[PDB]
């Protein structure tokens, strides 16, 4: 009745855990804040006409 | 039948088709040196642009 309680385990569960995403994070730069985008809008050919 | 069947001629029938020219397509592009210039932070930017 008069010993200190022993403790004998101490287990730390422990998971690493992925992102699915990470193929996708490409490693930019960070100066500057704004970012643009753009494309070329169609443009059909025509016929020639020598008149 | 009488026998001058013979000196009668029966040409070989056909049928054609005729087609004729197709079209001469066009299309350009202008491309500026003054003001395309004012857009285009980068040299690089502009000439890929005007890839």
């Known amino acids: ?51 | 039948k009488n026998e001058e069947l013979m000196l009668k001629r029966n040409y070989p029938r056909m049928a054609t088709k005729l087609y004729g020219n197709g079209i001469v397509k066009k299309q350009k592009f202008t491309l500026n040196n003054n003001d395309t210039r004012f857009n285009f932070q980068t040299l690089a930017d502009a000439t890929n642009y005007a890839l």
């Open chain 1, 1 to 51: 009745k008069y010993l200190f309680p022993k403790i004998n385990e101490t287990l730390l569960i422990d998971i690493a855990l992925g992102n699915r995403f990470n193929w996708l994070a490409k490693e930019q730069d960070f100066i500057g804040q704004y970012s643009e985008e753009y494309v070329i809008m169609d443009t059909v050919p025509i016929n020639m006409d020598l008149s």
